[PDB]
Design a protein around this ligand. Structure first.
Ligand SMILES: C/C=C(/C)[C@H](N)C(=O)O
Ligand SMILES: C/C=C(/C)[C@H](N)C(=O)O
Ligand SMILES: [Fe+2]
Ligand SMILES: [Fe+2]
Ligand SMILES: [Fe+2]
Ligand SMILES: [Fe+2]
Lengths: 258, 268
């Protein structure tokens, strides 16, 4: 006695979810981050570095709170009789988390550092934040760590979803929809960071974190919804979370067009 | 601002852990389940089925509550700044319990059923519980699922450790230490279940779950006791170390009594 909603109702949940992402203006053509990454002619080290620091904290919180949300679900399945369809979707969350925590997918392990150095927020810190930080002052580095309010609200929504049995399904549903566009925007942003007249990212391998994500992203979560009430909650959480993700990315775009 | 204890203190935590597992009577020469699996002559389908159902529920709860425990710790690391030494031990937890959830390690990846059928409590259900169930009555099956008191007591501790940041380290430190001997015992037990005077499990393939664990648990035991990325590597201060050893004492005691339950049901 535990099973997913029928396919018909889960299809409607998927459709309502896609509509919430549309309305939150997260699509490739909608969000100011993707627009700015395309439009700007150059990016200062300080603006690139601040965006990179915000991203580091954002993706660190994304990974841990998604794992925390999976644990909240695990807490429930320990005593419940989840059917094999629910269990397979539970496995999927675990596999997807393992990309960020330990580079499970071969596209990642075939470029990432091993061990903790390969954790995606750490790998990002080491290969994107660190070379940018050599080109900003100590004052600017301190200021970058003072996260803008849209980023803080998103971090706060992630903390809330860490305790939700649907939280991991909400976060992955929104994030895996927008990850490609985010990674492509980063490729473009950091390809345009010059210090002096020199590219800060002048070696192909310096983009390895980004190109791997683009590659991975280039090639369901409603499967974890077990009744109509949870379905309503799922859509409601998505609406909130998508809107906050969109405001955080608009904050990236603003920083690039200051 | 978050780091493990220095190596010397962690090593003594590990030594205290091993002394506690000694004390708990969880070593193969001491626990009644390991001895009875060795000594018993034959095992009835009802008795082997009951133990299999208990094990199904126990390892189901072990895997899901260890995962919840890892989640509890992940909640903390989202709010704090764990250094890389801590993150390395964290990855160990993810990797170890991922074998039970998704057969990542090479010893399982090839033999285990794919997808949810391969989750180790499901795979045990399909390949040990179900063939035994054909030999027992529906009334028997229903009685087997009424779990004995020391099994329920272990499950309740598992539920508590689900919300503990140290919980996954406590569970993996103990379970991965005794897992080989449990699998060895199961190999012995279910080779001795007779029906029609004839062994229920006559083919090598029917032992795939058990044989895969006999191979794999050697490694899992080394991983949780490792002095660089082992379970004590998640202890971040002396007080947390105290709590760790206290939880280990409790958890190991409940595991030992649950296993004595196994041995009593194999004897009489
Ligand atoms: C591109 C977006 C992501 C969430 C990546 N998976 C990451 O690790 O930051
Ligand atoms: C043999 C003991 C275990 C905890 C196994 N890891 C299992 O899946 O039951
Ligand atoms: Fe990632
Ligand atoms: Fe991803
Ligand atoms: Fe297992
Ligand atoms: Fe194991």
């Amino acid at each position: 006695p535990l099973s997913p909603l029928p396919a018909v109702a889960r299809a409607e949940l998927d459709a309502r979810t896609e509509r919430e992402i549309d309305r939150a203006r997260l699509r490739r053509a909608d969000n100011g981050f993707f627009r700015s990454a395309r439009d700007v002619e150059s990016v200062s080290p300080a603006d690139g570095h601040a965006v990179a620091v915000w991203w580091r904290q954002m993706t660190k919180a994304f990974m841990f709170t998604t794992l925390a949300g999976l644990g909240a679900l695990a807490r429930d399945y320990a005593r419940r009789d989840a059917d094999r369809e629910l269990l397979g979707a539970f496995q999927t969350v675990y596999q997807v988390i393992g990309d960020d925590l330990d580079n499970a997918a071969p596209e990642f392990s075939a470029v990432a550092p091993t061990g903790p150095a390969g954790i995606h927020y750490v790998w990002w810190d080491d290969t994107i934040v660190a070379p940018l930080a050599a080109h900003v002052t100590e004052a600017d580095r301190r200021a970058a760590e003072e996260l803008p309010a849209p980023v803080r609200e998103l971090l706060a929504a992630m903390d809330r979803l860490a305790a939700e049995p649907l939280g991991s399904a909400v976060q992955l549903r929104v994030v895996e929809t927008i990850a490609l566009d985010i990674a492509v925007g980063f490729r473009r942003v950091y390809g345009k960071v010059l210090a002096g007249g020199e590219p800060v990212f002048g070696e192909k391998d310096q983009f390895a974190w980004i190109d791997a994500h683009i590659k991975a992203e280039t090639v369901g979560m409603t499967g974890l919804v077990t009744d109509a009430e949870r379905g309503e909650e799922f859509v409601r959480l998505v609406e909130e979370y998508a809107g906050l993700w969109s405001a955080a990315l608009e904050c990236f775009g603003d920083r690039l067009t200051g």
